Amino acid sequence: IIQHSIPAVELRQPFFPTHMGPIKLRQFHRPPLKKYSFGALSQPGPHSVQPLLKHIKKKAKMREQERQASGGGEMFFMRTPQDLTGKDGDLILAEYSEENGPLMMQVGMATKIKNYYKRKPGKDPGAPDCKYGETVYCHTSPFLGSLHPGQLLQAFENNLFRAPIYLHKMPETDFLIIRTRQGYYIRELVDIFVVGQQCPLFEVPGPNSKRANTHIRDFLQVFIYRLFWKSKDRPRRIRMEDIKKAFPSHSESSIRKRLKLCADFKRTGMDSNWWVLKSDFRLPTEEEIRAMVSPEQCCAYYSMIAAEQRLKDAGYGEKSFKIDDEVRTAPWNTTRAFIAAMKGKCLLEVTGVADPTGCGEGFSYVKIPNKSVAEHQERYKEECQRIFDLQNKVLSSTEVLSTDTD
Amino acid sequence: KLTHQVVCINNINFQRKSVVGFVELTIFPTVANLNRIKLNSKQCRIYRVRINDLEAAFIYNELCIKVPSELWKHVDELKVLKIHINFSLDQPKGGLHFVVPSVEGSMAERGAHVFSCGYQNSTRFWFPCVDSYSELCTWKLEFTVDAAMVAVSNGDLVETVYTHDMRKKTFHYMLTIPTAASNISLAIGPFEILVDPYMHEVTHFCLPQLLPLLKHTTSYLHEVFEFYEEILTCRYPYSCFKTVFIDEAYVEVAAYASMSIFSTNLLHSAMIIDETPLTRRCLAQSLAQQFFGCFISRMSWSDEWVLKGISGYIYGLWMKKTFGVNEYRHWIKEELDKIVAYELKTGGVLLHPIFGGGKEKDNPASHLHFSIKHPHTLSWEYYSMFQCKAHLVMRLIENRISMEFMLQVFNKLLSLASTASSQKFQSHMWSQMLVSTSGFLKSISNVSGKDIQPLIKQWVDQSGVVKFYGSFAFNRKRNVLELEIKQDYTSPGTQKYVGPLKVTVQELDGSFNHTLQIEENSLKHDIPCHSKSRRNKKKKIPLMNGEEVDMDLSAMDADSPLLWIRIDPDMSVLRKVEFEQADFMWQYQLRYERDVVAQQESILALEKFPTPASRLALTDILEQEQCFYRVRMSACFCLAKIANSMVSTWTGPPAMKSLFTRMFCCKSCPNIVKTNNFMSFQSYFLQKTMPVAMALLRDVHNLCPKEVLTFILDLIKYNDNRKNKFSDNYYRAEMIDALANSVTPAVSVNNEVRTLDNLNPDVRLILEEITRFLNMEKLLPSYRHTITVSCLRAIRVLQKNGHVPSDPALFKSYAEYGHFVDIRIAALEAVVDYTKVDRSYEELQWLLNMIQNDPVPYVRHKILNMLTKNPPFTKNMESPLCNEALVDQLWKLMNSGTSHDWRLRCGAVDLY
Amino acid sequence: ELESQFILRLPPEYASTVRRAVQSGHVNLKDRLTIELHPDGRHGIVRVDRVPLASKLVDLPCVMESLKTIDKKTFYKTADICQMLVSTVDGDLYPPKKFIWNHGITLPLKNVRKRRFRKTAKK
């Protein structure tokens, strides 16, 4: 059970962008430092980097007191955008080995760490302890390969994906800088996980699929309801211009569709007119709005449009998505293939063009039929096992390489 | 305010019917310049009121004790006075029940017994105290008793020792927690113990002569107490747990099955009386009410549903956890659906709110007569709506605020501490000590959930629905199967309501799927091209994909038999459905539904709604050996209700006498069915209603009756060969309902009873089973079922004709002689079932005399309510409610709340 | 607006000085460590106790997340990190593709771009 932060659950901006142009899609999950137009750090010259130690201790203390003040047990702390800052709480880094994994979290979403352990035969004294995560004793593997007896494997686990992770040490040279309009802050950060290839648990839709079109529609609908809720006017009213600015690729006519059932156009002598909430229309509750569209569904959709943009950039037209190698790497194909195989509907290529590492240390998620048929499945498991073990060994290794001069 | 009393009650003198001595009341007046104080006392001899070592003016109206004011502005905020009252108890206390040696009868003449019931304003029969739920007090207790008794109060026990030599002991009991005077009690009873170790000391009291029978409730207490600690995550602070079988403990505000005096559960007997669901319910509702209720003493009596909804809910988890083989999950909806019967009632009769907030502007009290003001209006919120609709709403709010979260909620609430701390280092501790309901609201609100003010408002005020209209379509061209569900509520103050209303359509071979939602008033919902189910190939449809995709494409491409849309799974919304053509829907829910909450309701609808032949098909669910006792029962009761229709009446019947011998092997039985447990006979709920399917059919059409009589004659040949066996009570008791409505049709040529002429063959033999064995003594069975419902076999075979004055002439005698608490109530329930028929005025006079003084107080309630239920008039209205002396008795039964029974005064309240 | 986060990398001698300062929590870290970014958005100067280090803002190959936690079992994403400010002891403080970093931060992602990233096929 995953409980996301309130800003994420509410699909607030900027945590959940309403629109992304080509540039943003290319930079998806890699935001570049952009200059500020105003505020302290818009100014030239040196700027102080501030310590956070007193602040970190204080927030931990305040949070624990709030915990004891009601009057123990479990509390949920991620209620406001302010609670999501890197400025307090314990922090880890996670570095993703896939250049563009099929699903990624937005800021404000939650994930668990699970410590998968397989018992040694006979008298097992229990799993080793880890600094992070909750131990899970598993007789069957949640991955493509099987755990060996006595093997502990850490992993990220959420509704988008499961992925093995490997704990490493941050280099002694490195610090985390947090940057706001107001100043820089610095934190020590020692724990950094390498993330291995994802096992997708959520299916990414194809471009212009019914699923995709239903999603943008519903997301637009949610944004609209939230606009009415934000309005302080009675009767509530919103401006077309504000919707168009958030959804610049929607025609005014398609926006009028979403508005015709809940609101009335009020014309004024000025090129700004209002849509006023109908007096017999009951605005959906917070709880009902949340049920309309989940953060996971937004993540699936984002994955599609970003991939679609990268494909266009590489010369692959919409008619391409009998199929080109590059199109096989698309998240709508890889997630579909992996999930089908998880349900026993087919097997996976494993060795193939969709291996995200390009060098045999990752899996190619491409459907092959279940179609000597005990040898067919034993060969699939053997190959899965080999790559599974290879990935764990390479990504957990502390060996120092050796810059490639090419 | 009275904060603390130390009460010193010497003697405890049985040879006066009386307890005497001194309460020392510390009072901190929470106001300037108090001159006089109002304590409460009822019927209590006062010797002397002493303030600061002078006698002080006390005038009894409610005592007004006049404070001497011997300092300036005296008595100001938080000054502290010791009021010293010397009191003496009267013999006929309302609070108490005092039996001296000499009126105990032949079998003791030695050992007195006096026992009191505190809650709710009966403390004023013990001592002058301020008797109020607002004034919160902790007490010390010193009292001396006969040393061959052992006594119980409220407040942790800190030592029994002698009263230095000779014949009276002094117990020292000491409460730490602030609780109202409601809580206080004293019970001075027998001394014979039976203690187990291992836990916080559980120990078992009864009469000395009845100690062998206290093993199976010791060890039940072992399991019930120990288990609950883990799942509630709450230790029980009190270091011991004493369960005592008072011979005078029949209450229904005290025990009942548990009275909650401090670490001394007061129980009725019910020692080995065959529990398996019945008192496993009773003692898991009991050991719930030691947490929420006592552990965490709320400061507001207007969310008493926090007590009783949380109590009902933790009964159901523990039941289905520890006993998982009678499968509680498929029984929860009986409780669920009975509250629906009472919430389908608007317009004079007969519904109430649950959240009962006393507001100033409460303009609608026509239907709310019960406030929540004094005393008996608290007692009466254990009526079924107040329990299992609180249960219902707590089960809902779980699903919205999830279960792990409400776990962290109630586990903090039990161990969240309310301290008192002053600057000279005086550390006080209250939990086991006051807690508030305002911060309960807030705590759950913080953890989980959205708007709970609206949702809970439409459980208490003017909300809920009656009827859901169903209409159907299915269009061939599109393959779109279209549903039109309206909803409708006849009452003042009607709205549109949410109620998750699921539908699951079943293809040619009942191999489909669904979902749906419907939660607006008039909705038309569109169900996509599901010719092939979502479970297309589980093994669902390789059933129509057996060979009925193409061979019977003659009768699938004729979609005139459309996809069969079963309605309301699992009583998914608690409404009355209006859905034409429903026979297939009931069958499909009988066979293929996985939750049996649906099934038992799909065969209540098979029973009633006109259905074509399912009879051979629902014999599947007659002997599906995974199913409840009660679904196998109400599968028989389908064939019972439907009862022939036409003149194939006697074609049902062979299937009935099939399980009239339920593999009955009566060539070893009934001598090795004493030795067996009967194998429950596959639930004797189901065996009862196979000869009672026969009997209903016998009742409904009067060209049955010879062949049924033949059938049920063989059941009578099986009987009179059994001994006592625990489980087999349920067999005997619902076979006496079997044998009733056999002679009942058998002489249904009515015109009086007259004498039934000369049907010796029946009347003799049937009375032979009806009456008790007159040799057999009745001082040996501690239970009585058979002869409770064998006076009912006596009546109803002498009610369908009518032998008037034979019936009460047993039950008067049987409620005089005293022996057997059950037997007495059995008799008194049949003395009012006979007045329900009798309508000579004299019998009702003698019935409200026996209401008045009989003089068990609680059997007094029982009779009073039962006469208040069954009215003395019919349709006609000749002199309606036009009395003068009953109205005096009425006002004199009002304000007997002031004495005790808080289910008597709403007896009056209903007949006002 | 989303919080911006990035990695600061110092030469080891300077990193030691700064780490002790972060750990002591002293307020004067704000004077002892400052960052100046030049108008081009790629070059800058980091100052440790007034000592200027030539610095360059580089683009990391792997997406990196920072996640915060209270119980060490449930984690919340606070940011995407994709850039590093690299300070060296030599170099032009004011300099008149070279900003693409080839390695992940962690050991096994050495040479990720060249060795461990499937490359895109055009057309």
DSSP assignment of B386-430 equals HHHHHHHHHHHHHHHH-HHHHHHHHHHHHT--EEEE-TT--EEEE
Question: What's the full length of chain A, in residues?
Answer: 406
User: Max Cα separation, chain A?
Assistant: 84
What are the backbone dihedrals phi and psi of residue B479, each rounded to the nearest 5 degrees, phi first?
Answer: 50, 55
Chains B and C touch (3+ CB pairs under 8 A): no
Please tell me the distance from the alpha carbon of residue B636 to that of residue B693, in angstroms, as a whole number.
6
Exposure string for A74-95, b = 16+ CB within 10 A, e = fewer: ebbbbeebebbbbbbbbbbbbb
Query: What single letter denotes the amino acid at residue B573?
Result: V
Distance of CA B213 to CAs B255, B269, B273, B628, B706, Å? 19, 10, 10, 31, 47
Q: Kindly determine whether residue A109 and residue C77, on different chains, have CB atoms separated by under 8 Å.
A: yes
Question: What's the full length of chain C, in residues?
Answer: 123
Please tell me the distance from the alpha carbon of residue A274 to that of residue B713, in angstroms, as a whole number.
84
**Which residues in chain A are contacts of C30 at CB distance < 8 A?**
48-51
- Tell whether A261 is within 8 A of chain B (Cβ): no
Q: Which residues share a beta bridge with C4?
A: A179
- Closest residue in C to A101 (Cα) is C63
CA distance A267 to chain C (A): 34
Cβ proximity of B114 and B98 under 8 Å: yes
- A271 CB contacts (<8 Å, ≥6 apart)? none
Q: At what angle do helices A331-342 and A295-313 cross, to 10 degrees?
A: 130
Triad A122, A125, A127: Cα angle to 5°: 110
Q: Chains contacting C with at least 3 CB pairs below 8 Å?
A: A
CA atoms within 13 A on the CB side of B64: 7
- B404 CB contacts (<8 Å, ≥6 apart)? A1, A74
H or E stretch at A155: strand A152-157
Pick from A72, A74, A285: which is nearest to B450 by CB?
A: A285
Interface test with A, best of B234, B406, B446 (most A CBs within 10 A): B446
Q: Kindly determine whether residue A176 and residue C7, on different chains, have CB atoms separated by under 8 Å.
A: yes
Please tell me the distance from the alpha carbon of residue A231 to that of residue A226, in angstroms, as a whole number.
9
Q: Kindly determine whether residue B416 and residue A70, on different chains, have CB atoms separated by under 8 Å.
A: yes
Please tell me the distance from the alpha carbon of residue A15 to that of residue A7, in angstroms, as a whole number.
7
Structure tokens at B209: 């002569």
Q: Are strands B564-567 and B576-578 parallel, antiparallel or unpaired?
A: unpaired
User: For chain C, first and last CA: distance in Å?
Assistant: 38
CA distance B234 to chain A (A): 13
Structure tokens at B468: 């859901």
Task: Tell me the three state secondary structure of residue A393.
Answer: helix
> Which 406-425 residues of chain B touch chain A by CB within 8 A?
408-409, 411-413, 415-417
Please tell me the distance from the alpha carbon of residue B187 to that of residue B262, in angstroms, as a whole number.
11
H or E stretch at A277: strand A274-277
Question: What's the full length of chain B, in residues?
Answer: 912
Interface test with C, best of A15, A30, A189 (most C CBs within 10 A): A30
Pick from A63, A109, A180: which is nearest to C3 by CB?
A: A180
What are the backbone dihedrals phi and psi of residue C102, each rounded to the nearest 5 degrees, phi first?
Answer: -100, -10
Q: Residue B802 — left, alpha, or beta (φ > 0 → left; ψ -120 to 50 → alpha)?
A: left
CA atoms within 13 A on the CB side of A390: 14
In this structure, the dihedral spanned by the alpha carbons of residues C88, C89, C94 and C98, taken in order and rounded to 10 degrees, is -30
Please tell me the distance from the alpha carbon of residue B501 to that of residue B515, in angstroms, as a whole number.
9
The strand order across the sheet containing A274-277 reads: A237-239, A274-277, A263-266
Q: How was this structure determined?
A: cryo-EM
Q: Kindly determine whether residue B447 and residue A76, on different chains, have CB atoms separated by under 8 Å.
A: yes
Cβ proximity of A97 and A395 under 8 Å: yes
CA-based nearest residue to A349, from A334, A337, A365: A365
What are the backbone dihedrals phi and psi of residue A195, each rounded to the nearest 5 degrees, phi first?
Answer: -100, 125
Query: What single letter denotes the amino acid at residue A328?
Result: R
Please tell me the distance from the alpha carbon of residue B812 to that of residue B827, in angstroms, as a whole number.
7
Rg value, chain A, Cα: 25
In Å, how far from its chain's centre is CA A35? 26
Please tell me the distance from the alpha carbon of residue B385 to that of residue B396, in angstroms, as a whole number.
16
**Proportion of chain A in helix, strand, coil states, percent, rounded to 5:** 35, 20, 45
Q: Which residues share a beta bridge with B488?
A: B467
- Closest residue in A to C7 (Cα) is A176
Please tell me the distance from the alpha carbon of residue B598 to that of residue B590, in angstroms, as a whole number.
8
Please tell me the distance from the alpha carbon of residue B852 to that of residue B855, in angstroms, as a whole number.
7
CA-based nearest residue to B632, from B679, B689, B680, B693: B689
Structure tokens at B550: 């193409």
Q: Kindly determine whether residue B404 and residue A1, on different chains, have CB atoms separated by under 8 Å.
A: yes
CA distance A162 to chain C (A): 14
- Tell whether B446 is within 8 A of chain A (Cβ): yes
Structure tokens at B34: 């108090």
Please tell me the distance from the alpha carbon of residue B187 to that of residue B260, in angstroms, as a whole number.
12
Task: Tell me the three state secondary structure of residue A103.
Answer: coil
Q: Are strands A134-137 and A263-266 parallel, antiparallel or unpaired?
A: unpaired
Task: Tell me the three state secondary structure of residue A161.
Answer: strand
Please tell me the distance from the alpha carbon of residue B667 to that of residue A328, in angstroms, as a whole number.
76
Please tell me the distance from the alpha carbon of residue B697 to that of residue B637, in angstroms, as a whole number.
10
Cβ proximity of B300 and B417 under 8 Å: no
- Closest residue in A to C39 (Cα) is A44
CA atoms within 13 A on the CB side of A10: 16
Q: Are strands B576-578 and B467-472 parallel, antiparallel or unpaired?
A: parallel
Q: Which residues share a beta bridge with B161?
A: B170
Exposure string for B182-191, b = 16+ CB within 10 A, e = fewer: bbbbbbbbbe
Structure tokens at B449: 């959930």
- Closest residue in A to C69 (Cα) is A90
**Which residues in chain C are contacts of A401 at CB distance < 8 A?**
107, 110-111
Please tell me the distance from the alpha carbon of residue A18 to that of residue C52, in angstroms, as a whole number.
42
Please tell me the distance from the alpha carbon of residue A179 to that of residue A185, in angstroms, as a whole number.
7
Q: Kindly determine whether residue C36 and residue A45, on different chains, have CB atoms separated by under 8 Å.
A: yes
Q: Kindly determine whether residue A70 and residue B451, on different chains, have CB atoms separated by under 8 Å.
A: no
In Å, how far from its chain's centre is CA A73? 29
Burial of B443 (0-12, 13-18, 19+ CB in 10 A): middle
CA-based nearest residue to B456, from B400, B501, B374, B407: B400
CA distance A217 to chain C (A): 25
Q: Residue A61 — left, alpha, or beta (φ > 0 → left; ψ -120 to 50 → alpha)?
A: alpha
CA atoms within 13 A on the CB side of A153: 26
Structure tokens at B891: 């006002």
Chains A and C touch (3+ CB pairs under 8 A): yes
Please tell me the distance from the alpha carbon of residue B202 to that of residue B78, in angstroms, as a whole number.
42
Other CB atoms within a 10 A radius of the CB of residue B142 amount to 16
CA dihedral over B787, B791, B792, B793, signed as positive or negative: positive
Query: What single letter denotes the amino acid at residue B665?
Result: C
Triad B102, B108, B113: Cα angle to 5°: 70
CA-based nearest residue to B503, from B600, B582, B557: B582
Please tell me the distance from the alpha carbon of residue B260 to that of residue B266, in angstroms, as a whole number.
7
Triad B267, B268, B273: Cα angle to 5°: 120
Cβ proximity of B233 and B244 under 8 Å: no
Looking at residue B475, what DSSP letter applies?
Answer: B
CA-based nearest residue to C102, from C78, C86, C122: C86
- Tell whether A280 is within 8 A of chain B (Cβ): no
